[PDB]
Amino acid sequence: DQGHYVEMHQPGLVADHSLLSIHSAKVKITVPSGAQVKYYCKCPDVREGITS
Amino acid sequence: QIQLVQSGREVKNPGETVKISCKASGYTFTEYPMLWVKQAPGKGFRWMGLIYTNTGEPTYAEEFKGRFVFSLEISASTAYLQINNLTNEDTATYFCVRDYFISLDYWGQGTTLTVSSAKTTAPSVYPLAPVCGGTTGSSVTLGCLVKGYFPEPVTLTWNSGSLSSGVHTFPALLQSGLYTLSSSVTVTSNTWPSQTITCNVAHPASSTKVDKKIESRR
């Protein structure tokens, strides 16, 4: 079937606070498989997040 | 591999400012920030804060927000501690440290500050040669007495530092308002007085440098 087609472009980001663990005093982010995790906190620290 | 080598120890009268450097070696400066820790004479170890060597943002421990200021000569892999309007109870040793592996993995040597009022007195450097008679063993101990200086620190080497094995340098101690230090060196009895042995002393605060060759008493 091809009689119509709808636009299906990317997802935006999504939340996953299962990532933000704790490094025994600091909040610790991780990554799925090397995916692109977009990161900073209300305080001043790493401001974009394109990381492991 | 990783070496954090710190500046030497200063003396400063109350009210002054000090900039303590920490020169980093072995790692990429930028991926590992710096911890500044104060080990106060009695009290034990205390975290003073951390500096993001990537962005440059410092965190201060609440005890340290104010007179303390972290900065970095990024370019030269140096982090620096500056303590302004020095209070007398800031005498202690400050360590830089690398934060890595969910903690701290390497510590520096320490830079000790002695906040203390006093003028500037150059040291007198005296050779210590063995007793006038005999002194016959398989080895021999010479010495060097660095007496009556202010403030700290002095540096002392033997033969420009080429003679380091068998050396005991004794921590400076305050006596009658002045510091006194001493050092011994032990060499085989064939070395001295056949070969020259020289005490090298520097007192940065007075721009004093003294080279004293140990001579036999007769």
> In which region does residue B160 sit, left (phi positive, over 0), alpha (psi from -120 to 50) or beta (all else)?
left
Task: Determine contact, residues B146/B155, Cβ cutoff 8 Å.
Answer: no
Antiparallel, parallel or unpaired: β B198-203 and B155-158: antiparallel
The span from the CA of B149 to the CA of B205, in Å, is 10
Q: What secondary structure letter does DSSP report for A33?
A: S
Q: Do A44 and B57 touch (CB under 8 A)?
A: yes
Q: How crowded is residue B104: how many other Cβ atoms within 10 Å of its Cβ? A: 16
Task: Find how far residue B173's CA is from the centre of its chain.
Answer: 14
Contacts of B79 (CB under 8 A, 6+ apart): B21, B22, B24, B34, B36, B51, B53, B70, B71, B72, B96
Q: Do B55 and A23 touch (CB under 8 A)?
A: no
Query: Which chain B residues are within 8 Å of A46, Cβ to Cβ?
Result: 54-55
CB hemisphere CA count around B212 (13 angstroms): 22
The span from the CA of B168 to the CA of B190, in Å, is 20
Is residue B102 less than 8 Å (CB to CB) from chain A?
A: yes
- Print the SS3 string covering chain B: CCEEEECCCEEECCCCCEEEEEEEECCCHHHCCEEEEEEECCCEEEEEEEECCCCCCEEECHHHECCEEEEEEHHHCEEEEEECCCCHHHCEEEEEEEEECCEEEEECCCEEEEECCCCCECCEEEEECCCCCCCCCCEEEEEEEEEEEECCCCEEEEHHHCCCCCEEEEEEEEECCEEEEEEEEEEECCCCCCCCCEEEEEEHHHCEEEEEECCCCC
Resolution in A: 8.2
Query: Which chain A residues are within 8 Å of B103, Cβ to Cβ?
Result: 24
From start to end of A1-52, where are the E strands? 21-22, 27-28
Cis omega (within 30 of 0) for bond into B193? yes
From residue B20, give the alpha-carbon distance in Å to each of A43, B9, B93: 27, 9, 11
Q: What secondary structure letter does DSSP report for A17?
A: T
Question: Which single residue is written with the structure tokens 């007179």?
Answer: B67
Q: Is the dihedral of CA B88, B39, B21, B168 positive or negative?
A: positive
Q: What secondary structure letter does DSSP report for A28?
A: E
> Which residue among B52, B102, B103 sits closest to A45, beta carbon to beta carbon?
B52
Query: Which chain A residues are within 8 Å of B102, Cβ to Cβ?
Result: 23-24
Query: Can you name the residues that pair with B128 across neighbouring β-strands?
Result: B143
From residue B7, give the alpha-carbon distance in Å to each of B1, B3, B62, B130, B201: 19, 13, 25, 35, 18
> Which residue among A23, A44, A46 sits closest to B102, beta carbon to beta carbon?
A23
Task: For residue B115, give the nearest of B82, B90, B83, B81 by alpha carbon.
Answer: B90
Question: Which single residue is written with the structure tokens 């009290």?
Answer: B43
Task: Determine contact, residues B18/B10, Cβ cutoff 8 Å.
Answer: yes
Nearest chain B alpha carbon to A28: B102
The span from the CA of B191 to the CA of B80, in Å, is 43
Task: Determine contact, residues B142/B197, Cβ cutoff 8 Å.
Answer: yes
Which experimental approach was used here?
Answer: cryo-EM
Tokens coding B157: 């080497």
Query: Which chain B residues are within 8 Å of A24, Cβ to Cβ?
Result: 102-103
Question: Which single residue is written with the structure tokens 């005991």?
Answer: B168
Q: Do A45 and B54 touch (CB under 8 A)?
A: no
DSSP helix/strand/coil, A44: coil
For chain A, give the longest Cα–Cα distance. Answer: 57
Nearest chain B alpha carbon to A48: B55
Contacts of B186 (CB under 8 A, 6+ apart): B139, B140, B141, B142, B166, B167
